[PDB]
Structures are given as structure tokens and as C-alpha cells.
Amino acid sequence: SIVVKNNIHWVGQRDWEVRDFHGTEYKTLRGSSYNSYLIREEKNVLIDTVDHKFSREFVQNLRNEIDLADIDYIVINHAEEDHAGALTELMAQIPDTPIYCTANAIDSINGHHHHPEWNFNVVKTGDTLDIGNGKQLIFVETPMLHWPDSMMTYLTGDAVLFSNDAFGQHYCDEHLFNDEVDQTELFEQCQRYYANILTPFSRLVTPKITEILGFNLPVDMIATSHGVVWRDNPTQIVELYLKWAADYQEDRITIFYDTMYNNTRMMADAIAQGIAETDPRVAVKIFNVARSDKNEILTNVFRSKGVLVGTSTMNNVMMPKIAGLVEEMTGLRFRNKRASAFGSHGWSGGAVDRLSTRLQDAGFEMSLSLKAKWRPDQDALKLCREHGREIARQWALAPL
Amino acid sequence: SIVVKNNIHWVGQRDWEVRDFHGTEYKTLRGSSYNSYLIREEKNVLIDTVDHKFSREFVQNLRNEIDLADIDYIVINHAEEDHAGALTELMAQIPDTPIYCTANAIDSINGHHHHPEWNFNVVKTGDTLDIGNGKQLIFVETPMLHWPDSMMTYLTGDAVLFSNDAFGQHYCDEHLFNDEVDQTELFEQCQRYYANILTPFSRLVTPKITEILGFNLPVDMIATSHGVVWRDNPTQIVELYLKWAADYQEDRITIFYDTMYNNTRMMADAIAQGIAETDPRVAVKIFNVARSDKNEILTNVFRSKGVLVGTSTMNNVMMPKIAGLVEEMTGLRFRNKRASAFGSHGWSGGAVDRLSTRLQDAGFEMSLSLKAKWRPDQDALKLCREHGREIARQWALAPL
Amino acid sequence: SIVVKNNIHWVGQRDWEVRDFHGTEYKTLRGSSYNSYLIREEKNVLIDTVDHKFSREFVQNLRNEIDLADIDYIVINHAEEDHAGALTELMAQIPDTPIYCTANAIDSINGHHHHPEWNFNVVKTGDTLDIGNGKQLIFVETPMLHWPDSMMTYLTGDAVLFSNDAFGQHYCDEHLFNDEVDQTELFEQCQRYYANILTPFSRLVTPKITEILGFNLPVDMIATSHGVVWRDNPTQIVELYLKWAADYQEDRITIFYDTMYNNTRMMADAIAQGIAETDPRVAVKIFNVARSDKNEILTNVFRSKGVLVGTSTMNNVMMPKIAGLVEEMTGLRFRNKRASAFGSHGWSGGAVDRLSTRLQDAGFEMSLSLKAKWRPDQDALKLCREHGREIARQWALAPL
Amino acid sequence: SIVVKNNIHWVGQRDWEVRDFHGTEYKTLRGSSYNSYLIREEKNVLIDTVDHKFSREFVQNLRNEIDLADIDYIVINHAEEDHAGALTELMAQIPDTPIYCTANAIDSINGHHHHPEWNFNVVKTGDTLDIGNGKQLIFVETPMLHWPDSMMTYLTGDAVLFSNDAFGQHYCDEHLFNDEVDQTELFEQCQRYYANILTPFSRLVTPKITEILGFNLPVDMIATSHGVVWRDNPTQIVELYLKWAADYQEDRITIFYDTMYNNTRMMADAIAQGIAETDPRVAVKIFNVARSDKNEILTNVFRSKGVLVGTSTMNNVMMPKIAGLVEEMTGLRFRNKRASAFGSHGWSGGAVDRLSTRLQDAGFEMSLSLKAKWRPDQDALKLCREHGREIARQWALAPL
Ligand SMILES: Cc1cc2nc3c(=O)[nH]c(=O)nc-3n(C[C@H](O)[C@H](O)[C@H](O)COP(=O)(O)O)c2cc1C
Ligand SMILES: Cc1cc2nc3c(=O)[nH]c(=O)nc-3n(C[C@H](O)[C@H](O)[C@H](O)COP(=O)(O)O)c2cc1C
Ligand SMILES: Cc1cc2nc3c(=O)[nH]c(=O)nc-3n(C[C@H](O)[C@H](O)[C@H](O)COP(=O)(O)O)c2cc1C
Ligand SMILES: Cc1cc2nc3c(=O)[nH]c(=O)nc-3n(C[C@H](O)[C@H](O)[C@H](O)COP(=O)(O)O)c2cc1C
Ligand SMILES: [Fe+3]
Ligand SMILES: [Fe+3]
Ligand SMILES: [Fe+3]
Ligand SMILES: [Fe+3]
Ligand SMILES: [Fe+3]
Ligand SMILES: [Fe+3]
Ligand SMILES: [Fe+3]
Ligand SMILES: [Fe+3]
């Protein structure tokens, strides 16, 4: 275990190997960690657990730290499998140990473990749990951030906010604190996490943070459920979350597509050229969805003021990877972004119009589409390049 | 080169390595071949070329077989990149050599090569091209089988049908003829090809074959553009195409899904059990679309009387791989098949209803959906197992 | 659960999703199953368990079949994680239940579970365990087939041989018996399993089967730990094991390589041509190790009389995937096979000689190597094709 | 095209999609570019070409910039396929155009293209080529940096060094110059390139740079063949090459392994713990070679003072991915690094000793190995953790 602060002990688990989260929809290229915390005052409190894969390691490591019978309270901020996966194994040893959680957590815990006989304690915002030595736990409900059962736990005196998933990131390192790791890699994992997971709940982020700030609770450290502990200027991640929640966008355009004979690819490259020579302010990224990291594409979409999506017509519909990606974007609900569909066709086409409509369904403000037949020649590439010019002028943040 | 029959020489190319066709939407697990043919009578005729990757090998191998200036006619049955990719390199050496093709082929050839100065000869069904020694080529238009430019070329006397893509398969072998290869692997590649490529054009297959049969043309061999040459009972593949085109289905049910915590997986397995114990006649296959070969899933769908598709609710929509697969099935237009959507959810759900509707859009006759919350317990698995029973009884080909 | 025969119940688990075994060194393209059996006579005996992934399901399904306290004996034929993974979870409920296994199994069970306080019973070949109703279990030691702890359990009366890994295969199907599944797929998975796993233990196969046959024990069914139960002509898989163990080879040559600019690939294709035109009897397979299924290559190697391995020179050594594959072949110990190293180089080369030596280390009888500089021209390809001729004539099983 | 400086025009090609170089041994996660340059003074000089994939685009784009007959000289700094792939297509239009290159380049050009009838001009260090307007090209031989044919071309007046592969990186961006792109991403791609490609030629780097500096030639820009053009403080990449060539290492330890039951993984994690609590200065990275990016592991190895490699015993040999990686490291020739082999075994083992020996063959100074049986218990993990302590104390750059 690792000492977080005073009697707060990190009893979590590092995961150097993990590459797949949420099925295969989240790629953790830099591993992850599952942070659990054991507070040892007059009362002994365990906060969250770890992933199911390390259930047996978690209990044994917990035994080495403390006798399991001496654990007074268990706090579950969130009942996902990567935080409550090792709960059943633990409760098999100490079944009478009370669990403090939200009302919705009772539904989610019993939903997976099927053990309603456990001693649950419903907590709501403002409720306190005394642990002795002048210290107490304060619970703060955060529904749909990013689950209905989600909440945070604050420890007075030590001024530590156990925020669970919030302000966390999938980043595995031997060092525990934020000032001990690579800042660039840390920022990348943080933004990647928010973009792919927390984007559709952005409307709830700012009012919830504003509510918490009103409590006037001092914050020395922010101990999340994933990655580093924020101890050096810990509110820096809170400020990033405030920026990212306000329909975040940079002067940036992301282009992604799928192609069978690179005809649409040629269109994509030509569009990008037109943009660059019209608006030097705009940063442009190009991706082949069949050949690229999906989460990286989505992170760029999150950072972009607008996107262009390319697809060829395949059996009168669009290419499935493009279709799948558009479906996911519809769930993420990007805001204040604009889009334009493009692609090549053989005869009757139809996929480009089909794509433009589904992009509109995803919440994008649509501009005119760009269509081309077979392989674009020199004249056709001019029209594609011209299309990029028109997009740049329309989506300009400022004149010229 | 290899002797097909008499003065017919296979001057094509084997591809032991190829794994990706049509971007990444067709997996060739057993490689492929690109069959080109050189007929040497009084006239010298080249029929089709090969993939663009082997353009330089093709011309050189062609030089070793014959002086390029001695090539009298070039026949293009189909102007795709895996058949007309090496055309530009070839025509760069013999630009005055006439090209015989369909009217639509002029649009597709010029669409990729951008060389309209070539000497094109529009051919239609019934047209002949004499090559001497009492032999002639007969052209047969086959629009939308599977491209608008598609046609077949028949050689009299030798009774050889150059069918291009039709009756072909992606199967690489040192032996050229069908009776020289593994029959099981051959059948698998044939059915895989039809299911993933030719399914939406099934309505055009039977009338076109019936039209060709009316010509009363003897068939000794069928020389396709991919895989083996059919010489031993060559009409066996024609009969398979007739069977596969008639909205083909077996007493079979395919179940596929994507899952994040295996909750939907548990539902899938429970459904399958209910089916097996209700209708022993039904063959059941189960796939995880994130962990399986996509084309294999589609081949099973093609063979199935009905399917069940599973997805969890992710950001109020369905999982993208399921969405992508449903989009592709909408293009393939499966017929006389039935479907049922299922999956697990956390709170409000909605993905299952969303999936059922899109399956209906794909042409499936929909049965009732199956929904479950979180991880299915013993009682919940009973309902899933019961759902499989109801599906089996409804989709029964015969009573009991 | 499923009735195997009389009071024998299959209480195992199907795995439709599994694709990776032994890390990533075995690909199960058709899933797998983990077969556990519950015999209910006067005594109740459980034979083996399942993979750790389905541990909670295994125990729960076992409860639905019988009260856990009514389980009299537990038989562990083999203590691997895919057979003894759910042991700890089970023994946590019934710790006093005796375990019957080999002496080496005590080391392997305690090696993973760390529960030496369990009540182990060492069994040896010929030892019996009465279960009532005139029936008894007979244990047969099979060390290094394929583990030191490996054994088989025979049930008298019902004449059922519980062979564990032996005669098994990774094949998932809703039907349990061999006469109920696809015979071609069954054969493929059986041979694939033997080639990649049981090849180095081939010398031990024949004497052990001969020893078992000497017991004159009637065999009605063979219940393995993976895949189908052999009930219809169960000795068919025994004869296959006898054939495969005798340094199995067909008139077949497998060629595999890795390449950076397809120079070595061009050599590979030319070699294959030389073989085919010299010995038409020989079947030839070509693989790119970077683009193919590794286990399929090894299955072909197992079936081949000889192989040719290709590599280019990379930093004065060979390409890593070739190095890795040769290392694995060194462990598999193929017998009575011949080999030839080939490949392209830029200047000083050396990788081909390095490869030839390591192939000799793997047990292959080496023929002359083939070297070429850069991209092989027409003259160079003649030498490559000529090399295939020389190899074909040398490795001929019969003249011409 | 893009203006580099004055009459120097970038006529290269961006590659947003490329992910595989040298077969599959180099992963370009951020794409790449192929830089070609057209100098238009009194004479017109083309410097290098692009990859074969963009050959038709290269020639066409070149036509749009200038009439091909007006091209006076062609300079080939390096005849690899990603620099000379489009040479044949170009020379097919202007065969009489002279080619300036090293003596070894004649062998490498003719080795691939097979056109020795081309007009080659052998150049050596110090040789000049006048292009008018007071400007001239100066050639500098750089054999085995990183090919025998490799050289650089310097343009007087404009003070531009065409370094080809040297100082380049695989990084695709719409902006051409180094001060216009993300500095962190640029540094990562630069170091990644050197570590995986230029490491074994490090002994040649420093003397060659020293030789060039002796020429006292002003360097305003460095135009490479891959990635950005260095115009803003161009000597920053030169200093990095000087640092990286001097047997570069940081206070860092990289641990990588392959595992079948995570037994070796448990050992790896325990070792890392022992190191971290013994020497807090040391940075530790852990990788599973079957689940990680191979090039990233090698970049970490390059940056590390020492490594620990893990493998289990599989058929009396080591796991193939470990074998393959060690083979590649043997070619890369890392210097002044130390190593320790570890891993789990079932009975007789042997793979750990086998690995330790091959690590010694790769040039690592070996410390004692670490062996464990089956799954490491609490006592075994103590020894593993203790091993990390012993390694940390031994490999310390400074006391404590
Ligand atoms: C499998 C397949 C299906 C196709 N279906 C259609 C279609 O339904 N309508 C159409 O106009 N073109 C169709 N085409 C032609 C392509 O749209 C055309 O080749 C396009 O220009 C190539 O796009 P890409 O290279 O950018 O992927 C199809 C092509 C293929 C290979
Ligand atoms: C990223 C993510 C998004 C989710 N979105 C929703 C949602 O929008 N509505 C809902 O009811 N449940 C949602 N859930 C909960 C899952 O649907 C629930 O855990 C389900 O039972 C698990 O399905 P599976 O394990 O079969 O994939 C979400 C879960 C995750 C991980
Ligand atoms: C990264 C790299 C390293 C190389 N190292 C060597 C070498 O050490 N010795 C040599 O003779 N050639 C070397 N070469 C040249 C190749 O061996 C040569 O290009 C070969 O003909 C190509 O083989 P392939 O296309 O079959 O992969 C190297 C090439 C590359 C790209
Ligand atoms: C396919 C296979 C082959 C094995 N071969 C050997 C062997 O030759 N010698 C040995 O001592 N153990 C052998 N073992 C046992 C492993 O070394 C043992 O399970 C080890 O502790 C697991 O290592 P890992 O989980 O780190 O991969 C083998 C295991 C498997 C699955
Ligand atoms: Fe979560
Ligand atoms: Fe989480
Ligand atoms: Fe086609
Ligand atoms: Fe085709
Ligand atoms: Fe086993
Ligand atoms: Fe097994
Ligand atoms: Fe190079
Ligand atoms: Fe290069």
C-alpha cells in the first residue's frame, strides 16, 4: 500500500497491461489503475474496491494492511465492475459490515451481486459519517456523473475529496501523485477520458461543481478511482473540467473516413489542402477509421469546431465503420459543432446524403455535402479543394 | 502461365498473403487469386487483368508469354481494381490496342484511369468477336451482377465461359482446377463470397442464368476471375447460385451481440439453451461481434432462417459495432428472415427498441424484444431461456 | 446440464467467445468448452471443473444440480486453470471434500491455489474408487500427456473414459456428442490441437495407449475436458492420435516467411513454382507469418514432410517473427522433417545462414540454403524456381 | 507544393494512414511523410522521390510544378522504396535524365529497378554540382547511416542540408516546418525513430557530424526525407542525435515479459515494487509484449539504464514473442545496459537460463536471474520484491 496523507492509505491496484475498457470501445494505451482507499482513524473506512480481475489480490493485500474484521464502514461511491468488482469476494469475509452509498447504488449493487441481504446505508448530499479524532466523511450526490449511483466522499481535516471517476484518468504509473508523473501524458489521458466518457453529461458538470464550491470545503487533495492523486494545485483538473464542459472546441477541424479504393481518401486530402490555404488558424487532423484508434478520433472531434466525414456508397448504404462511429457520436452528443459529409460513388450513390442526415441526427449543424464519381481527376480534386475553402470561410471563428 | 484448355492460357496472379478486400470489410483468410486469360488462335485475345499490386509482374509475365504488340484484342468483363488495376501499365505499352467492354464499362474504366483516348468497343448481349480457326467470342451483359459494367465472355468450340466475378471465390492454391483442391474449403469460400457480396443482387441472378441457359451454349469449363477453374461438373456452382439466390435459408438461428460486462452475453447463452431444448432441428451459432470474424457472422446470417441481435444501452444508443453491422445488413438486403432484439440496460435503456427498429429497416420480420436489467439472476435467466423457447416455436419450419 | 450416459451429467461450460489460450499463443477461432462431469450413484463424484472466468457460474450451476454437501469425491485429472480454475471457489463451500489426483497434481494444485490443508488422495495406475451400484472409478496415470500431473479416470459398467485433455479439441457447439456436429470442423480442431500442443509428447502417446488397451476395458464413450463427447465410434480419435504420433507427415511442403519489401516473398512464390512443376504430387502452402494465423502455419508444418523458411537480413539478424516461430518449433520438436532456409539481403547478409542453423537446432534435416540480393530479377527468379526443383527431387517420397 | 526557401519547393507526399513500415516491424501511429524537393535555379534539380504507393500522384504533381523535360538532374541520397519507389515511373518519362548518387546506390538502385542503362553519376564527399546563380550542390557520403548508399546533399547560398533519413521522423502534419507543429509529438517521433532504427549505427553518428562541422558550412535549414523541415534552431535535432548516439540512457528501468497465466506478471509487478522502494530516482515501465506496442518497448529500452525480461517455460523453451524481441535487440546492439532474466516454471523449467544467455548475446551485462514455481505466494513475492531491491542497489548510478 501507499500513504496518501496521514492515515489515508492507497490499497488499490495498478494495471500495466489493460488495453480494453467497455468491451472494446475504450482503448487504454497507457494502462490504468483502480484506486481504493483505507482510512484508519478511530473508525476504519474502506472507500471503493478494484476491478474484478484483481479481486483475490485486493482482499489479500487488504489483509496485510488490516484485519478485515476491524473494518467498520465500507463506502461505495460507484458500483461499476472496475470499482465494485471485488466487493462480493470481500463481503464473503465480512458480510455484516455496513455499506454507505446512494439510493441508486442499492439498485446497481444488487443488480450485479444479487446480495440484497447486505446492510446498506442510503446517503444523500450533506450527510455525515464520523470516523473519530475530529474528522468526518461528507457525502455529495452526483447523479449521472457519469452514472445514476455516482457520488463523492469528502474527508474533513485532511481535506481530501474522494471523487471516484470524476477528475480521473486511465494512466498507470509507479508514482501516485500528479506532480510525480509526465504532465503531457497525464493531460492526454485526462482529455481522452472526458471526451470519450463524460461528453454527454457536460450540462451537469458545471452546476454540480458550482454546488460543491458553495459548500466551502477546503481541498488539499483529490483522490480519484483511476490514475494519479491530485495534490499539487489539485483544482487544475477541476478547471479543465469546467473548460471541457462548456461545449469545448478549438480552432480545429477533424476529417475522418473509410474507403475501399482510396477515392474518398483523395477527396479527404484535397479538402484539407483547401482549408489550410484559406485559414492558417485552423488545425487539421485526418484519420482512416479502419486504420486508426477510434478514441483518438473522438478526442479530436471533441477538440474540433467542426468535422468532415467521408464514406463511399456500399450496397446503397454507408460503410459500417462510419455508421458505427456516427451512432456513437449520437450518444456522446457533441455541441456547437458543424459538419459536412463527403465521399465517392460508382453510379446512383446515396451514402453521402444518408451520412449527412445521420450527422444532423447526432447534433451537428450541417453544411453542403461534397460528392464525386469514381477516382477524382485533376478537375475533380479542384472541386474538393474548393470545398475545403468554402468550409474554412464558413466555419471561421473570425473574419479572413 | 498455366494451360486452361488448348490455346487458353491462365496468365493471372496468386495472392497467398491478402487478408483485406473492400477496405477491411471482406477478410480473405485463405488468400485469393486474380485470373487473367490469354487466348491464342488466329487472333490473340487478353481477357481481364489482375490487381494493382501485381501490375508490374503481370506485364512482365505477359511479355514472357507473348510479344505485347501481337495482342489483337483486350476484353474487360469488369473494370474493378482487382481486375483492371494493371490496365494502365499495360496500355502504356500498347495504347492502340482495342478494348471490348460494356457501355457502362467505358464510364468505369475512364472513371479510374482517366484515359478516354483509348479505343473502346461497346458490346452488348449476342455480339460476336471472331478470333479465327472456327472459334468466336460471345458477349453476355450482366448489369448489377455485381456491378453495372459487369458482363461475361463465352468462347465457342472450347466451350469456356469467362464469367469474371460470377461463380468465383477468394481461394489461393497452386492447383488451378476445382477437382484438384479441397472441396470443403472450396465450398466455404464460395458461400462466403456470395453471402457477403452477391446477396443484395439475388433477384437478378435467376433471370440472368435462365436467359443464358436459353442461348443453348455448351459449357465445358467456367473460368472466373477469382480462384479455381470449374472443369469437373462445372454447372455445380451454377446450381449453388440458383439455390443461394432464392432467399436461401436453413433450419438455423444466428445470435450475435456486443457486450461490456457480459450481461448481454449471459442473455445470449440463455436464449440459445431455450431454443435447443424446444426445437432440436435448429442449428445455433453465437458470436461476439467485437471478438469474431464479421464476414463469418454474415455468412451464418445468410444461412439462417432467423437471427437474434444483442446490445447494451450505451449513452442512450446501441453499441457501435452492432450499429455498423446492422447498417451493412441493410445494404445486403436479406430476405424471408425474422429477427428479435435483446440486451441489458442500467436505467432508462432504449438501445434494444432502437435496435429492433433498425433491424426492421434492414428487412427482418420482427418478433418481440427481450430486455433485462444489469446482470441477469436465476429468475431473469429463466425469462431469457423462455424467450428462446417462444422464438423457437414461432420460427419453426414445421410443427413441434 | 446434459445427460452423458445414465447417471453421468455434463456440468461444464461453453465458451463461444474465447479466442486466446496460453496467453496469445493458441487461437481458438471456433471457441471452446470446459467439460466437467457429475456422477450420481451411491456416491456423488465430480470430475474436473472449468475455467476461472466461469467460476461463479460453475458453482451456481452445480448447486442447481445437487446440494454441494452431497458431493462425496472430487477427481482432478489435470490441474490447469481451464480445468481447476473454479476449484478454489468450490472448495470454499466444501473444504472437507476429498480430492483424488496424481502425486504431481498435489504440487500443481498447491502451486496455484495455495491451500495445502485440503484433503488430497494420491492415486496411481490401477487404483480404484468405489461409487456404489456395482460401479467403480479406475485411475490411469499419463505423465507428460501433456502435463506431469495428467491422468485419466475410467468408469466401469458405463464404460466411460474421462480422458481430460487427451482426445479433446477446442470446439464450441450446443450439441455435446461427436455425431451431432460438423465432422470437418471437428477434424480440423482436433488436428489443430494435437499439432500445436501434443506434438512434442508424441513418443509417449503410443506406449500409453498400448498400455490402456492391455487393460481390456470396454470403451463406450470418451468424455474429454474440451469439446465433444465421443460416443459414436469413439475409437476413431484414438486411431488419429496413433497416426499423428508416428512422426506424422503427408506429401506436403509448407513455405513461410516474413518480408519488408516482398523480395523474400518473390523468392517464396518462385520456389513453389519449381516444386509444383517437378513433383505434382506435393501439396504446397505459403504463409506470411506477419499476416497469417500462427497456429495454422504450425498445423501445416505438422502435416508437411518438409518446410522452407524465408527471412531478410535485418540489422545483421533475422526478422523477429521468424525468430519467434523457430523458437516455438524448437520446443514442439518436429520429427523426420527436412528444411531449407532462404531470403533476400542488401549487402553482407547473414540472416539466412543464421536461420538455417536454428532450423537445424529445431530438429530439421537441413538442405542447401537459397540467397538473393535485393529484388530478384528474371534470372534470379530462375534460380529460385530451380531451387524449388532441387528441393522437390530431394524430398521426394517416391521417384518422379 | 510548398515553398521551403526561395526556389526550393517541397514536392513530397503526406501519409495520414500509414501504420506499418518494414513489414510490420515499425508502427507509425502518427502517420508519416515522404519529402521530395525541387530546386529551380539556372538548372532544375529533383532530390529524392516518394513511396511507391504514391507514384502516380508524385509524377502528376511534379508535372503541375514543372515540365518533366526541364528537369536537369536527379539526386538520390538513398535508394529505399520510400524514397526511390516512384523512380521507375518518373524515369519512364525522362530516361536520359542523369542520376547523381553514391557508388553503393548504383547497386541498390539497379538492385530494385533493374534499369542499369540509366545514366548514373557516382559522387563522393566534397564533389560539387553547379546549378547556377552562384549556387552549387555539395555531396557528403554517410555510409551505413543508415544504409551503405546513404548520403546527404548540401545547397550553398540557401544553406539547406538535405539529410534524407537523418534527423527525420515519421510524423504527418499539414504544416511543414518544425516551429509549426506540436513539439512534444515531434520529440516522441524523433526519439522513436532513432531508437528503433539508428541505434546500431550510433558509433558512426558522432564522427560523421564532427566531419560535417569541419566543413564550416552554414546551416539555415535541414530538409529531411521524413516529417518536418527544421528551420527554427535546426541544430536542436543534431544535438539530440549527439546525445542519443553516446550510448544514451536515463535513470530508468524497463520491464517486459510474456505470460500464459499471469504468474510471470505477478513476478514483474513485485520486482517493480522492490525497485521503487529502494531507489525512488529510478523510473520504471512495465510492458506485456503480447499486449503492447513493440516499438514503444524498444524506445523505453533505449532510454533505460537496464532491463528485466520475463518469460515462462513453454515446451522447454521460451515464449516466442520474447524470443523474437531478444533477436531484434541483438541486431539493435544496445550499449552500456544491464539485464536480468526472470519467469515462472512448472517443473524442470530452463527458459529463464535460456533467456539470460540470449540477453548476454544481445550485449547486456547480466545480473542474477529470478526463478519461481507456478503462482508466487506471499513468501515467493517477497523474494521477487527482494530481487528488485538487489537489482536497484546494483544498477544505481549513485549511492542510495
Ligand atoms: C462492394 C461494393 C459495393 C458498392 N456499392 C455501390 C452502390 O451501391 N452504389 C454506387 O453508386 N456505387 C457502389 N460501389 C462503387 C463505389 O462506391 C465506387 O467504387 C467508389 O467511387 C469508391 O469509393 P472509395 O474508393 O472511396 O471507397 C460499390 C463498390 C463496392 C466495392
Ligand atoms: C459507457 C456506458 C454507458 C452507459 N449508458 C447507459 C444508458 O445510456 N442507459 C442505461 O440504461 N444504461 C447505460 N449503461 C449501463 C449498461 O447498459 C448496463 O451496465 C448493462 O446492464 C450492461 O450491459 P452489457 O454488460 O451486456 O454490455 C451504460 C454503461 C456504460 C459503461
Ligand atoms: C531496417 C533494415 C535493416 C537492414 N539490415 C540489413 C543488414 O543488416 N544486412 C543486409 O545485407 N541488408 C540489410 N537490409 C537490406 C535488406 O536485407 C534488403 O532490402 C532485402 O533485399 C529486402 O528483403 P525483403 O524485401 O524480403 O524483406 C536492411 C533493410 C532494412 C529496411
Ligand atoms: C503449453 C505449456 C507448456 C509448458 N511447458 C513447460 C515446460 O516445458 N517446463 C516447465 O517447467 N513448465 C512448463 N509449463 C508450465 C508453466 O511453465 C507454468 O504454468 C508457469 O508457472 C506459468 O507461467 P506464466 O503464467 O507466467 O505464463 C508449460 C505450460 C503450458 C501451458
Ligand atoms: Fe465508471
Ligand atoms: Fe472507472
Ligand atoms: Fe468485383
Ligand atoms: Fe473481384
Ligand atoms: Fe492442459
Ligand atoms: Fe485443457
Ligand atoms: Fe531508409
Ligand atoms: Fe525513410
Side-chain angles (χ1 to χ4, degrees), chain D residues 16-200:
Chain D
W16 291 94
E17 293 193 0
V18 58
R19 289 294 186 272
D20 284 330
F21 261 92
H22 300 160
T24 62
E25 301 308 326
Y26 195 98
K27 303 291 185 178
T28 56
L29 302 180
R30 299 198 179 276
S32 180
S33 72
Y34 318 102
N35 302 336
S36 177
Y37 305 94
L38 177 64
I39 309 172
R40 310 189 65 169
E41 297 292 333
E42 296 188 36
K43 290 293 187 301
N44 300 308
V45 178
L46 183 66
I47 300 183
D48 294 319
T49 66
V50 301
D51 190 277
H52 179 267
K53 291 179 295 178
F54 303 95
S55 55
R56 83 190 299 187
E57 292 91 341
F58 177 69
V59 173
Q60 179 56 223
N61 290 336
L62 201 56
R63 292 185 186 272
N64 301 335
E65 194 73 18
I66 193 179
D67 195 315
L68 298 189
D70 291 335
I71 296 179
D72 300 289
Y73 314 116
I74 298 176
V75 176
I76 305 299
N77 294 312
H78 176 33
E80 201 167 10
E81 82 164 354
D82 61 328
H83 309 302
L87 188 56
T88 295
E89 183 78 6
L90 176 64
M91 299 302 295
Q93 298 298 327
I94 44 174
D96 292 335
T97 305
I99 300 176
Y100 289 80
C101 61
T102 65
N104 289 332
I106 290 189
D107 177 85
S108 64
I109 290 174
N110 293 333
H112 193 281
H113 301 274
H114 307 343
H115 288 278
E117 74 279 355
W118 289 344
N119 299 322
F120 297 101
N121 295 98
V122 177
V123 300
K124 318 173 291 185
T125 300
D127 286 351
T128 60
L129 182 56
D130 301 326
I131 64 178
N133 296 326
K135 301 180 181 179
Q136 69 181 4
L137 299 176
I138 306 179
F139 304 104
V140 178
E141 295 177 273
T142 63
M144 293 312 297
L145 291 175
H146 54 98
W147 272 30
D149 73 336
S150 299
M151 75 171 186
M152 305 187 196
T153 305
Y154 178 79
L155 175 57
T156 64
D158 293 326
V160 173
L161 181 62
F162 301 94
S163 60
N164 200 257
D165 283 344
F167 317 112
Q169 77 288 149
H170 292 301
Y171 188 25
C172 186
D173 194 275
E174 283 297 322
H175 297 90
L176 183 60
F177 303 107
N178 67 291
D179 58 287
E180 291 181 323
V181 303
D182 183 274
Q183 299 303 291
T184 306
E185 293 181 2
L186 176 59
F187 181 86
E188 287 174 350
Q189 294 306 315
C190 282
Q191 196 177 48
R192 179 181 178 96
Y193 184 80
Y194 192 95
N196 287 265
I197 306 300
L198 307 185
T199 300

Side-chain angles (χ1 to χ4, degrees), chain D residues 246-262:
Chain D
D247 302 337
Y248 182 84
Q249 64 172 36
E250 304 168 2
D251 209 339
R252 171 179 295 258
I253 293 177
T254 304
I255 306 175
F256 56 91
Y257 59 90
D258 205 339
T259 186
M260 296 181 293
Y261 307 114
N262 300 279

Side-chain angles (χ1 to χ4, degrees), chain B residues 101 115 125 136 148 153 165 171 174-176 197 201 203 207 223 225 228 237 251-252 301 321 347 364 375 388 399-400:
Chain B
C101 62
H115 288 278
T125 301
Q136 69 181 4
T153 304
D165 283 344
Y171 187 24
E174 283 297 322
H175 297 91
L176 183 59
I197 308 300
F201 318 110
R203 284 294 301 272
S225 61
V228 300
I237 188 57
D251 210 339
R252 171 179 295 258
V301 169
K321 289 182 180 61
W347 39 99
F364 294 100
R375 179 178 297 265
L400 175 66

Side-chain angles (χ1 to χ4, degrees), chain B residues 80 82-83 165 193 225-226:
Chain B
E80 200 168 10
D82 61 328
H83 309 302
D165 283 344
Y193 185 81
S225 61
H226 287 298

Side-chain angles (χ1 to χ4, degrees), chain A residues 20 22-25 80-82 107-108 111-114 144 146-148 196-197 200-201 258-261 263 290-291 294 314-321 323-325 327-328 330-333 346-347 354 358 373-378, chain B residues 20 22-25 80-82 107-108 111-114 144 146-148 196-197 200-201 258-261 263 290-291 294 314-321 323-325 327-328 330-333 346-347 354 358 373-378:
Chain A
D20 284 329
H22 299 160
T24 62
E25 301 308 326
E80 200 168 10
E81 82 164 354
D82 61 328
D107 177 85
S108 64
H112 188 279
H113 301 274
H114 307 343
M144 293 311 297
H146 55 99
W147 272 30
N196 286 265
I197 308 300
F201 318 110
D258 205 339
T259 186
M260 296 181 293
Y261 307 114
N263 293 152
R291 305 295 185 181
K294 187 207 67 173
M314 174 186 176
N315 298 323
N316 306 287
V317 300
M318 75 188 71
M319 301 192 62
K321 289 182 180 61
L325 191 47
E327 175 81 355
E328 182 171 2
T330 307
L332 291 179
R333 291 175 175 261
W347 39 99
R354 185 180 173 90
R358 288 196 171 181
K373 197 177 182 182
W374 303 117
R375 179 178 297 265
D377 52 31
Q378 296 303 298
Chain B
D20 284 329
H22 299 160
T24 62
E25 301 308 326
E80 200 168 10
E81 82 164 354
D82 61 328
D107 177 85
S108 64
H112 188 279
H113 301 274
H114 307 343
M144 293 311 297
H146 55 99
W147 272 30
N196 286 265
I197 308 300
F201 318 110
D258 205 339
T259 186
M260 296 181 293
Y261 307 114
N263 293 152
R291 305 295 185 181
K294 187 207 67 173
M314 174 186 176
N315 298 323
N316 306 287
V317 300
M318 75 188 71
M319 301 192 62
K321 289 182 180 61
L325 191 47
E327 175 81 355
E328 182 171 2
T330 307
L332 291 179
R333 291 175 175 261
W347 39 99
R354 185 180 173 90
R358 288 196 171 181
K373 197 177 182 182
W374 303 117
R375 179 178 297 265
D377 52 31
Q378 296 303 298

